[PDB]
Amino acid sequence: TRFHSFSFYELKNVTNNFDERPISVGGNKMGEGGFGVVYKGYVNNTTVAVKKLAITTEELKQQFDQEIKVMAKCQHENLVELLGFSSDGDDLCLVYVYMPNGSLLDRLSCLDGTPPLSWHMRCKIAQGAANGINFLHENHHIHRDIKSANILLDEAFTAKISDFGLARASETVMTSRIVGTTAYMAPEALRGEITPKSDIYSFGVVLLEIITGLPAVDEHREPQLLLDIKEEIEDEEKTIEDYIDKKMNDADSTSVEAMYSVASQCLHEKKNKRPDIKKVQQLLQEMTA
Ligand SMILES: O=c1[nH]c(N2CCOCC2)nc(N[C@@H]2CCCNC2)c1-c1nc2ccccc2s1
């Protein structure tokens, strides 16, 4: 698949000169951290998300080329759709289909007054995100940064996996440049190993965030790291019912326990004991069915 080459000045013009101001006051900024800032824009009769990239300038160009490579090979309903790019101007830009419901992290934290996600919507999001990871693993790609901030939500709250800049083709390797988000990383990924089993572990943390509505890491909380609740529950001090997000009215114990069981299996500290993505996908389908 081939993409449209956008002019930097067209992207600069539709995003109000890449405004740092947010949604309310009159700017276009939609979020940052994923090695760039995402801005809202309107191009060729469509609402778009324009990611202006902003380690080394060469490493940032490597991730720009990697994102296009992965997106050229990988088209799926549970991956964000790349509409084009821009290399001509000062800053590297990636253009996507606009995701009106932001990220799963934003929606789990009810950022900007949005209503809490229902258990019914959370199940669809978990299944959709697992279908997106399955498609990546089937095409021998390792995401390397699976987290709720990288699961975007469209007009129908369909889960769309994003950020393929750090993605690696497999088609267990070792690396000197350890990348990803600490609170979601498998022990072997924190040591430099590159394997699709690390994406399964990170997805297990995403499933706990979905059940609990709690962020993967919170400086003002005990445990500070969400993955530690797996041990508090296993060493029967608590149960998953004590951790269910109170901001839901439709969560039943049976399906929550079925999602928690998938998460627990994903979070096995030994990479070879974790289920593969097809098994995770099967278990999430049986939970609903
Ligand atoms: O299209 C988008 N809309 C919004 N909304 C729209 C509604 O108002 C709030 C902002 N947020 C986005 N991402 C950020 C990511 C960081 C955390 N917060 C959300 C995207 C995309 N972000 C990306 C990122 C990579 C690839 C494609 C896309 S599309």
Residue spans of the domains in the chain: they are 1-98, 99-289
Ligand 1 site residues, Cβ closer than 6 angstroms = 23, 30-31, 34, 38, 49, 51, 80, 96, 98-100, 102-103, 106, 149, 152, 162-163
105 Cα nearest atom in ligand 1: 17
Spatial contact of 125 and 131, defined as CB atoms under 8 Å apart: no
CB 209 within 8 A of CB 217: no
Contact 267, 205 (CB under 8 A): yes
Interior/surface letters 59-75, b for 16+ CB within 10 angstroms, e for the rest? eeeebbebbbebbeebe
Helix (H) or strand (E) segment spanning residue 73: helix 57-73
d(CA 219, CA 85): 37
Q: How far is CA 91 from CA 50, 51, 224, 238, in A?
A: 11, 10, 36, 50
How many residues comprise the chain?
A: 289
> Quick one: which atom of ligand 1 is closest to the CA of 99?
1
Long-range CB pairs of 113-118, under 8 A, 24+ apart, other chains included: 116/213, 116/245, 116/247, 116/248, 117/157, 117/248, 118/248, 118/249, 118/250
User: Cis omega (within 30 of 0) on the bond before 223?
Assistant: yes
Instruction: Assign 20 to helix, strand or coil.
Output: coil
Retrieve residue 30's tokens. 């939609």
CB-hemisphere CA count at 13 Å for 196?
A: 19
Residue 199 belongs to what H/E stretch? helix 197-212
CA distance 232 to 202: 19
Find where tokens 């509409």 sit: 83
3-class secondary structure, 85: strand
Tell me the two tokens of residue 8. 């930097």
151's tokens: 């699961």
> Which residue, judged by its Cα, is nearest atom 4 of ligand 1?
102
Rg (CA), the chain: 19
In sequence order, which residues have a C-beta less than 8 Å from that of residue 196 and are 6 or more positions away? Answer: 137, 142, 170, 276, 277
CA separation (Å) from 272 to 40, 153, 169?
A: 41, 31, 19
**151: CA distance to ligand 1 center in Å?**
9
Judge whether 280 and 130 are in contact, CB under 8 Å: yes
Residue 44 tokens read as 């060729």
Q: Look at residues 93, 94, 114, 95 and name the one whose alpha carbon lies nearest to residue 103.
A: 114
The span from the CA of 101 to the CA of 99, in Å, is: 6
Which protein residue's CA is at the shortest distance from atom 17 of ligand 1?
31
The helix/strand/coil state of 152 is: strand
The token duo for 112 is 């900007």
Which segments within 6-45 are labelled E, that is strand?
Answer: 29-32, 36-43
CB of 95 closer than 8 Å to CB of 52: no
Classified by CATH at the fold level, domain 1-98 comes out as Phosphorylase Kinase; domain 1 (3.30.200)
Nearest to 98 by CA among 54, 141, 39: 39
| CA separation for the pair 154, 104 (Å, rounded) | 10
Q: What is the maximal distance between C-alpha atoms in the chain? A: 59
Compute, in angstroms, the gap from residue 257 CA to the centroid of ligand 1. 30
Binding residues for ATP: 30-38, 51, 147-150, 163
- Is there a catalytic annotation at residue 242? no
98: left (phi over 0), alpha (psi -120 to 50) or beta: beta
Class of domain 99-289: mainly alpha
- Which of 20, 38, 76 most suits a substitution to test ligand 1, by most atoms within 8 Å of the C-beta? 38
Is 206 in contact with 104 (CB distance < 8 Å)? Answer: yes
Q: Which residue in 19, 65, 145, 154 is the catalytic one?
A: 145
> What is the Å distance from ligand 1's center to 93 Cα?
14
Centre of ligand 1 from the C-alpha of residue 174, in Å: 31
Short-list 262, 264, 272, CA closest to 226: 264
